[PDB]
Design a protein around this ligand. Structure first.
Ligand code: R64
Length: 384
């Protein structure tokens, strides 16, 4: 190409047709819900379902600067049924080593009907969202998932911090180690009911300006981070709006005796559903989002980094969280071990579409794929 006559054969008719979704129309947002609730991953064992919420979608999929045309779905011509979806959300990331800002997107929510796998549909979905994205002059992309596509940035591993061990054991998630005691393990995980750190309080739209700077100076230690604007950060830490508490994302700051912000952390909530259980049908879960501390240069860093995350946990209880989850990215390996974070079983792979760059650290010993204490990781961004 360019050619007089295309060399390869042309497409044959299909039973599916492209349909851009409108999460503004509650009727469609409802379909998206059903699609994900019925065919999206979960625990390998198979007994869990993400508990999406109308309030979670507005948060996750409508960051400032979002586009509808990036919400692509595939429906069946006959019945109209929505059988696939893939979304793209605007994000600005930067490499700290080579110093470069790259306005790109975050490919998320790739989903195909449980009974439509093995049709090479997945790939078709990507090249498409990409085609649309490439139309806005963006040429790179971030995504996480199966070790399918080659040349991944790095690999991180799951970590689970049991807040309500018992309930977890009921659902068959956490297993009781060789000779111990349900009653005893419950203590090994027990935590206070109040944040140890003083000057700790929820964040507000007034702390954005500040916190963003604190963050911007903390991430310097990673090879790839995210660069938010003021309207963006607010959204991602505060929710649709400040004048109305977000039930999805929780953020907190710590002030000193002078009224200055020295630390901060955030985390989001997205529970599970316990199926064939006669006790409960909802597992509270929180994912560690972004955080920061100006003590990184100080010598007490890690000591502080542990208190900080430990308070974040004590707060997770006011929301029904039964397990606190995070990966091995960022400087998490500093607080894992001592906070009683349990090593998981799942692995995540980060990808950067159309852009070569040195592989970074995932936080795990590349050989045993097991966690490695105090080891700053290249990955300093968090994707849902
Ligand atoms: C997934 C997940 C799980 C679990 O499945 C889990 N925890 C307790 C019991 N189970 C079965 O545990 C994690 C630990 C770290 C990061 C994680 O995931 C990080 C990525 C999260 N994506 C969530 C998401 C958001 C929007 C759409 N789909 C998925 C996870």
């Amino acid at each position: 190409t360019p050619e007089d006559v295309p060399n390869d054969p042309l497409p044959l008719i299909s039973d599916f047709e492209w349909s851009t979704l409108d999460i503004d129309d509650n009727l469609q947002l409802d379909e998206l819900y059903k699609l994900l609730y019925d065919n999206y991953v979960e625990d390998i064992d198979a007994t869990f379902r993400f508990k999406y919420s109308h309030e979670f979608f507005q948060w996750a999929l409508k960051p400032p600067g979002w586009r509808k045309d990036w919400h692509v779905g595939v429906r069946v011509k006959s019945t109209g049924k929505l059988v696939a979806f893939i979304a793209a959300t605007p994000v600005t990331f930067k490499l700290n080593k080579s110093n470069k800002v790259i306005d790109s997107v975050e490919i998320n929510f790739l989903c195909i009907h449980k009974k439509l796998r093995n049709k090479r549909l997945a790939p078709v979905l990507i090249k498409e969202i990409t085609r649309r994205v490439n139309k806005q002059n963006i040429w790179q992309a971030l995504y996480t998932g199966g070790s399918i596509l080659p040349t991944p940035l790095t690999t991180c591993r799951y970590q689970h911090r049991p807040i309500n061990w018992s309930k977890l054991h009921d659902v068959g998630f956490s297993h009781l180690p060789p000779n111990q005691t349900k009653s005893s393990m419950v203590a090994s995980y027990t935590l206070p009911n109040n944040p140890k750190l003083k000057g700790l309080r929820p964040m507000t739209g007034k702390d954005v300006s500040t916190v963003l700077s604190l963050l911007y100076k903390y991430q310097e230690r990673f090879d790839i981070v995210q660069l938010f604007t003021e309207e963006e950060f607010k959204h991602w830490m505060l929710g649709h709006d400040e004048n109305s508490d977000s039930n999805v994302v929780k953020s907190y700051v710590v002030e000193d005796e002078n009224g200055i912000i020295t630390d901060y952390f955030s985390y989001y909530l997205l529970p599970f559903t316990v199926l064939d259980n006669a006790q409960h049908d909802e597992l509270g879960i929180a994912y560690l989002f972004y955080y920061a501390s100006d003590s990184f240069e100080k010598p007490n860093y890690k000591k502080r980094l542990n208190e900080l995350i430990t308070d974040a946990l004590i707060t997770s209880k006011k929301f029904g969280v039964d397990v606190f989850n995070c990966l091995t990215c960022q400087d998490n390996t500093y607080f894992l071990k001592d906070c009683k974070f349990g090593s998981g079983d799942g692995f995540l792979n980060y990808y950067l579409f159309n852009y070569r760059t040195f592989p970074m650290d995932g936080g795990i010993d590349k050989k045993t794929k097991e966690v490695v204490e105090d080891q700053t990781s290249g990955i300093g961004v968090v994707l849902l």
